[PDB]
Design a protein around this ligand. Structure first.
Ligand code: MG
Lengths: 448, 42
DNA sequence: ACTAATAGATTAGAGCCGTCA
RNA sequence: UGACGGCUCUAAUCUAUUAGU
């Protein structure tokens, strides 16, 4: 018996400085924003991987359709959407040992086998990069589980873009089971697969598909997350910060501040007092030097309530005329609603205000144009809380929705949580594989 | 400014540190992909 | 001044399964 | 690791009290 406020969906930008809503529509209509003259690839693995990859790459150049194109737009062609050259006649290949005496990998000593395989792969890649004259841009790895984690950790020092594709992703036609049916049927989302792989390859080669153009100046975004690690004394260190979202005179930036500040305690998921100052100190100057001025208003996101003394220390650390707000987002809250009539759920963009601070927000509601709903079942809301800080609630409620579509790893219409927490989480498990890394790089290309 | 040919160790070290840190920060921070770097010196 | 046992209320890993009738 | 979502079991600290050597 309460009205629910509806917030209009934000919009994104595309080539020629014009506005749209769905990234796929802009790609199929106007393509990318910036252009790269081409990409030169490089592959590692077995010769079966080579022939399969070449076959798939030549398959990509022709258009493909979907089961129901209204649910997922068709793929018209790689060169059609982008115009960036990518061919199968400029591939370098380094052979791998094929006898494979250690065929017992999946049922043997995990640490030794993982270290040996990752050392072999990384050493071969390093030799190829440091010896061969031919230039390379990316690297695709095909292998026939704590496996993909170590691959990027050691290579992070050498600053080389990387990509991994499962051997069953490309040649799923013959990947049959004991019954004989494919284990991962892809007969309905092949076009969207091409969309995802093409956009990932385009980004990791240095191309920027799209940027936001409905943002306000003098604002900064930040996020924090915590992960579990136990080596000697169970130091719950984590504190792997991410996101900067600064705005210079013109442009968007996604550098972020990285580095595992330590919490030596056991269950104190709340931030340490000594480490708190360094985070904001390392965050401020990165924006300051680019934009020549201090950030008037700043934001802080999290996923766990934090104590008071950290907030105090931030308050003395923060400069004059800067508001600090900690936004807490919760996913597991039972608020199952129901449309009164029909076999059909509620929209997306509906917000419910219960008080001055707390709020319930929806993101997984059906698109008016997709003729269906993103969630398989009836969707569940998310909960937004403002722990500390004074600001306007309505602009915060509308502003989070604007950050629900900057997922570069895929081309879905939107993602439930804001991608800041997603980026922080993704950095977490990949930076903690090796403790010997010092001064990690400040780009998203290498570990995505 | 000008510190004469003396302190030539510092004279080369300051400039080389400046250029090296600039190049390293550009390589490890920016998003655009680059292949070559043309250094211009007066 | 720390060691066991019942609750409320937070809070993090992993593992399956479908892909929109 | 293609990527997203919906689920399914497992664990753990912070309060505030009680029984206890
Ligand atoms: Mg990925």
């Amino acid at each position: 018996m309460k009205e629910l406020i509806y917030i209009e969906e934000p919009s994104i930008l595309f080539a020629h400085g014009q506005k749209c809503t769905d990234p796929r529509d802009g790609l199929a209509l106007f393509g990318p924003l910036n252009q790269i003259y081409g990409i030169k690839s490089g592959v590692v693995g077995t010769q079966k991987g080579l022939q399969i990859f070449k076959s798939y790459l030549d398959k990509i150049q022709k258009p493909i359709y979907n089961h129901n194109n209204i649910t997922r737009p068709m793929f018209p062609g790689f060169e059609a959407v982008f115009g960036c050259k990518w061919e199968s006649q400029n591939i370098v290949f380094k052979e791998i040992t094929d006898e494979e005496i250690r065929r017992y990998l999946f049922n043997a000593s995990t640490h030794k086998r993982t270290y040996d395989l990752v050392t072999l792969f990384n050493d071969k890649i390093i030799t190829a990069n440091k010896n061969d004259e031919e230039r390379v841009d990316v690297w695709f790895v095909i292998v026939p589980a704590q496996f993909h984690d170590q691959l990027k950790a050691r290579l992070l020092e050498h600053t080389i873009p990387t990509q991994i594709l499962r051997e069953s992703t490309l040649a799923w036609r013959d990947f049959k089971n004991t019954f004989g049916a494919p284990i991962r049927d892809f007969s309905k989302i092949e076009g969207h697969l091409a969309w995802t792989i093409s956009t990932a390859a385009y980004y990791k080669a240095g191309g920027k598909p799209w940027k936001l153009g409905d943002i306000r100046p003098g604002v900064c975004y930040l996020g924090l997350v915590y992960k579990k690690i136990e080596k000697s004394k169970n130091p719950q260190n984590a504190c792997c910060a991410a996101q900067m979202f600064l705005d210079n005179g013109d442009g968007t930036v996604f550098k972020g501040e990285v580095g595992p500040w330590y919490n030596p305690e056991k269950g104190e998921y709340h931030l340490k007092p000594k480490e708190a100052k360094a985070l904001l100190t390392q965050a401020l100057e990165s924006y300051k030097e680019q934009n020549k001025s201090y950030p008037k208003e700043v934001f802080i996101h999290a996923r766990t309530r934090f104590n008071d003394e950290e907030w105090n220390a931030f308050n003395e650390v923060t400069p004059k005329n800067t508001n600090l707000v900690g936004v807490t987002i919760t996913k597991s809250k039972p608020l199952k609603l129901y449309k009164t009539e029909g076999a059909f759920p509620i929209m997306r963009g509906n917000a419910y205000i219960v008080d001055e601070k707390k709020a319930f927000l929806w993101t997984l509601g059906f698109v008016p144009k997709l003729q269906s709903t993103l969630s398989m079942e009836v969707p569940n809301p998310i909960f937004i809380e403002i722990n500390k800080g004074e600001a306007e609630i309505q602009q915060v409620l509308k502003d989070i929705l604007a950050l629900t579509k900057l997922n570069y790893n895929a081309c879905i219409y939107a993602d439930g949580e804001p991608v800041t927490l997603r980026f922080a989480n993704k950095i977490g498990e990949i930076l903690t594989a090796s403790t010997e890394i010092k001064t990690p790089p400040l780009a998203f290309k290498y570990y995505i």
